[PDB]
Amino acid sequence: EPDLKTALKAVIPAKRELFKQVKERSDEVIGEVKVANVIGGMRGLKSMLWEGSVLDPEEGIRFHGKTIKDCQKELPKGTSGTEMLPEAMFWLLLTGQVPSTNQVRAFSRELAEQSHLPQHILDLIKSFPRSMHPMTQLSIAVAALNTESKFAKAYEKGLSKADYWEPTFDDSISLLAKIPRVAALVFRPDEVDQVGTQALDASQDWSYNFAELLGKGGKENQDFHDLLRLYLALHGDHEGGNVSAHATHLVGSALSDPFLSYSAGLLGLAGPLHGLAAQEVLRWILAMQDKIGTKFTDDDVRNYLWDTLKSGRVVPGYGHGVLRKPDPRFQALMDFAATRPDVLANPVFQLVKKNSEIAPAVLTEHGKTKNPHPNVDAASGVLFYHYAFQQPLYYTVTFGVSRALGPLVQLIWDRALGLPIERPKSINLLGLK
Amino acid sequence: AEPDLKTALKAVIPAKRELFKQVKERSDEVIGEVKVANVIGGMRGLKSMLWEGSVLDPEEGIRFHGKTIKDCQKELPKGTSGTEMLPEAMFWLLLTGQVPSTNQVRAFSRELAEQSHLPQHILDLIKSFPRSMHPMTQLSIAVAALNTESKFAKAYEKGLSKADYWEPTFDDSISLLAKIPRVAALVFRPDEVDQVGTQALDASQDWSYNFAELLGKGGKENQDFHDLLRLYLALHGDHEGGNVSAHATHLVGSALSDPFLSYSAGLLGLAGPLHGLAAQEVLRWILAMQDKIGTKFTDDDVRNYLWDTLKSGRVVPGYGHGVLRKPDPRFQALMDFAATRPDVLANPVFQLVKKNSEIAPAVLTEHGKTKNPHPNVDAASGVLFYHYAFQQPLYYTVTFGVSRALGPLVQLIWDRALGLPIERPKSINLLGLK
Numbered sequence: 001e002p003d004l005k006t007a008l009k010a011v012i013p014a015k016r017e018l019f020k021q022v023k024e025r026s027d028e029v030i031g032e033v034k035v036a037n038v039i040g041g042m043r044g045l046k047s048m049l050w051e052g053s054v055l056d057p058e059e060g061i062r063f064h065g066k067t068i069k070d071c072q073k074e075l076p077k078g079t080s081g082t083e084m085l086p087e088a089m090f091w092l093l094l095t096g097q098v099p100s101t102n103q104v105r106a107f108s109r110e111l112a113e114q115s116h117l118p119q120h121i122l123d124l125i126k127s128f129p130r131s132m133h134p135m136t137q138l139s140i141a142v143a144a145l146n147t148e149s150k151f152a153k154a155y156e157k158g159l160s161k162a163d164y165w166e167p168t169f170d171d172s173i174s175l176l177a178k179i180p181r182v183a184a185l186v187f188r189p190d191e192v193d194q195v196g197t198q199a200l201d202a203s204q205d206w207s208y209n210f211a212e213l214l215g216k217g218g219k220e221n222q223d224f225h226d227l228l229r230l231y232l233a234l235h236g237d238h239e240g241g242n243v244s245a246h247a248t249h250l251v252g253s254a255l256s257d258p259f260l261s262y263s264a265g266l267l268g269l270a271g272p273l274h275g276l277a278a279q280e281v282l283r284w285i286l287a288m289q290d291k292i293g294t295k296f297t298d299d300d301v302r303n304y305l306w307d308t309l310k311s312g313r314v315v316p317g318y319g320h321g322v323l324r325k326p327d328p329r330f331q332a333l334m335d336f337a338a339t340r341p342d343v344l345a346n347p348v349f350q351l352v353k354k355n356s357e358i359a360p361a362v363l364t365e366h367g368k369t370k371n372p373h374p375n376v377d378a379a380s381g382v383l384f385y386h387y388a389f390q391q392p393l394y395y396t397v398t399f400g401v402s403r404a405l406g407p408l409v410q411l412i413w414d415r416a417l418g419l420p421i422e423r424p425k426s427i428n429l430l431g432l433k
Numbered sequence: 434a435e436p437d438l439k440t441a442l443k444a445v446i447p448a449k450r451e452l453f454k455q456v457k458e459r460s461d462e463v464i465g466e467v468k469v470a471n472v473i474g475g476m477r478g479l480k481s482m483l484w485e486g487s488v489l490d491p492e493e494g495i496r497f498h499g500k501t502i503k504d505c506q507k508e509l510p511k512g513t514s515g516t517e518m519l520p521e522a523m524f525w526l527l528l529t530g531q532v533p534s535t536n537q538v539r540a541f542s543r544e545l546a547e548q549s550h551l552p553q554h555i556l557d558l559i560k561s562f563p564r565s566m567h568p569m570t571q572l573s574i575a576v577a578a579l580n581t582e583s584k585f586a587k588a589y590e591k592g593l594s595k596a597d598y599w600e601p602t603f604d605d606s607i608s609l610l611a612k613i614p615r616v617a618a619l620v621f622r623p624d625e626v627d628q629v630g631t632q633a634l635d636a637s638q639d640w641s642y643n644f645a646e647l648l649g650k651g652g653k654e655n656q657d658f659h660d661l662l663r664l665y666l667a668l669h670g671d672h673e674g675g676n677v678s679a680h681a682t683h684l685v686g687s688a689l690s691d692p693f694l695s696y697s698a699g700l701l702g703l704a705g706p707l708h709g710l711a712a713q714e715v716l717r718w719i720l721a722m723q724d725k726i727g728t729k730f731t732d733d734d735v736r737n738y739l740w741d742t743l744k745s746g747r748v749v750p751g752y753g754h755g756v757l758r759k760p761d762p763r764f765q766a767l768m769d770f771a772a773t774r775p776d777v778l779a780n781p782v783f784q785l786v787k788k789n790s791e792i793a794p795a796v797l798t799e800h801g802k803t804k805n806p807h808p809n810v811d812a813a814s815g816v817l818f819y820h821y822a823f824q825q826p827l828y829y830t831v832t833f834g835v836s837r838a839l840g841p842l843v844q845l846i847w848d849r850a851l852g853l854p855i856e857r858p859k860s861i862n863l864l865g866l867k
């Protein structure tokens with residue numbers, strides 16, 4: 001059966017024809033720009049192209065029209081376990097098609113084989129102080145991988161616009177292969193020489209191998225391997241509007257290669273209002289457990305919610321900029337938890353769950369939070385914590401692994417369609433008067 | 434004892450917050466349309482971001498709180514010696530809307546010299562870089578790594594009111610400005626990391642002078658180059674919010690990533706061939722022109738070479754603007770620097786820039802595919818650096834990177850002071866447009 005590159009090569013003509021048709025309608029009006037859009041971070045403004053996913057305010061995120069549940073049903077699984085593979089999600093995002101299981105196996109083999117790192121990346125990582133925030137470490141080491149960029153070199157030689165997409169593809173695959181190893185090196189700074197050169201099991205999936213590099217390989221960790229697969233698939237893409245996806249696209253649009261461009265995305269993911277949300281939730285939950293105890297009641301949880309809000313604080317992991325109904329990424333994680341009795345017996349999980357049953361009504365009554373349903377960040381941290389990954393500073397590093405998926409797909413499409421530099425116009429306050 | 438920078442900014446914040454409230458009361462007002470062309474065309478045409486410090490005027494070029502380049506050359510404080518406006522003074526104007534006194538700038542230059550030292554780990558990180566790692570990659574990486582020193586990131590982690598966000602933003606912005614010329618010099622001088630990375634700076638010298646000293650271009654003998662450098666860094670500090678470096682800084686910053694991470698994103702955008710490379714392209718093109726036509730050129734030779742470039746299907750770099758309808762006043766400010774240095778004027782490469790600026794606009798109009806075919810700043814900057822023996826064009830973007838910290842850091846400070854939200858547009862697929 002076709003490999004990924006071949007499969008992408010077969011859908012490129014249909015995408016280019018679709019693009020030509022849309023371009024023939026260039027003069028068509030689709031929206032207004034208001035003052036609110038200028039001062040409000042472009043919120044509500046339909047102004048960028050993004051092929052792979054469309055975030056529906058009522059249904060949540062869809063991937064070529066498929067729900068999360070559709071993807072959990074249709075996408076190939078690992079050689080063992082129950083959860084859909086992130087490599088299969090990548091295939092679907094890129095091509096618009098669901099790969100066969102043996103297509104995904106040949107693709108997982110590519111990701112295991114291209115995972116090795118040049119020596120200088122080991123040296124760079126070993127120079128980091130141990131107190132350097134893990135997302136800073138991750139962003140820096142991805143950027144540094146630009147020494148290996150095929151796009152950057154091919155471009156420097158003279159490269160036709162028609163040939164841009166293929167080196168972009170080769171670099172994207174290279175990045176995906178290497179990023180879990182860079183992530184594990186962030187986690188395991190005393191073992192950089194071992195973990196940074198360890199050969200990966202050639203028949204295991206991307207997430208399994210990631211877990212092995214984290215020191216969480218083997219039979220004993222098989223539920224965690226499924227969590228990881230699900231988590232990485234769920235977080236791979238969420239439209240083009242989010243800061244990490246947009247930053248990748250923006251930097252990429254200047255023809256910076258995928259290593260540089262996704263490094264910009266990771267720097268945006270390091271933001272407290274973007275990728276660090278999950279870490280903040282776990283901290284807030286643990287401080288709540290600390291005050292009210294493991295034999296907490298609804299009443300305890302309700303008072304702590306009210307005490308948080310009355311002090312002028314936010315309840316993290318609730319509300320969204322676009323979403324209007326409960327986040328189907330949150331629900332898919334809650335559904336994973338529902339069938340693991342040991343997760344359900346964990347009080348920190350019980351606390352997350354009870355909080356998800358009470359918080360939405362408290363927040364509505366308090367009245368300052370837009371659509372106060374749980375988002376994915378409400379739950380992800382506590383599930384990692386359960387599996388003895390009790391170092392919340394590193395949860396965002398896993399988000400960084402996942403989130404390479406969707407934005408790299410769109411970079412490939414950007415270069416294949418020949419999209420120009422992203423260049424809005426700016427204005428001052430005095431100009432708006 | 435006149436206000437320091439922080440105090441001066443603190444005095445204009447209330448007026449800016451009142452102006453912002455007034456604009457916000459007009460939230461529902463329509464200012465333009467979104468067309469299909471805008472979505473597929475990289476938001477070109479779309480007025481969709483706030484940027485306070487600079488605005489492009491179609492007749493007068495870039496203006497900084499309404500001040501032309503000529504106004505800034507007249508009014509802004511100069512160094513203890515030399516003829517050119519200081520970048521520290523441009524920063525002050527961008528941030529505050531006001532012109533600092535000369536002693537205000539001196540107190541500010543002293544702060545920048547005092548905070549210029551680097552943690553040891555940044556020396557170690559830079560020494561790990563391979564020799565072939567592109568300089569902009571090195572610069573972006575080392576700026577990000579300075580986030581270990583971020584007061585915003587730690588203050589935020591402790592609990593910080595929204596109203597106080599701007600202050601740690603400001604402290605980190607100043608810290609970044611202080612350190613970036615030392616990081617830049619380390620990018621230029623990878624064999625001397627230990628020496629250049631700990632070298633004590635003259636405590637009463639300006640930002641650019643000290644940068645030049647760290648580059649190995651200190652002293653009386655380099656005083657004209659110190660003026661060039663001052664002017665270059667001032668002229669390139671800000672040019673609206675739409676350009677990739679400014680926008681990326683703003684975008685990353687809007688997620689509350691600290692200024693080190695945020696400007697590191699800008700530098701990654703500046704590394705992009707369609708953003709960071711114009712000055713290098715002009716120098717190459719000018720030297721290849723000198724190479725083919727020699728030192729004894731005439732108007733007619735220059736004219737034929739322009740036409741031969743355009744007939745080959747090639748661009749004449751450093752000419753053209755989308756809006757601006759006269760020469761770029763940044764170009765002219767560089768030409769005015771040259772006018773008083775006889776040795777620059779005797780350099781044939783400069784003579785070639787100049788004659789080319791007198792002939793190219795008419796040739797390009799007659800050719801007809803370049804909108805407003807007047808010189809831009811890039812037409813001159815590279816050749817002036819080349820004259821001063823700064824003949825490693827691969828590193829010109831590093832110097833642009835130093836300059837371009839100025840405007841975007843100012844906007845980050847204003848973003849946090851006004852409490853602007855996360856930048857998050859809506860996206861759409863091709864099928865949704867059809």
Ligand SMILES: O=C([O-])CC(=O)C(=O)O
Nearest residue numbers: 014015018064096863864
């Ligand atoms: O999968 C889709 O969304 C349809 C598709 O391939 C295209 O847009 O050409």
Ligand SMILES: O=C([O-])CC(=O)C(=O)O
Nearest residue numbers: 161162163415416417418
């Ligand atoms: O390759 C094509 O047919 C379309 C093209 O030129 C581009 O990528 O801009």
Ligand SMILES: [Cl-]
Nearest residue numbers: 003004106107
């Ligand atoms: Cl494959």
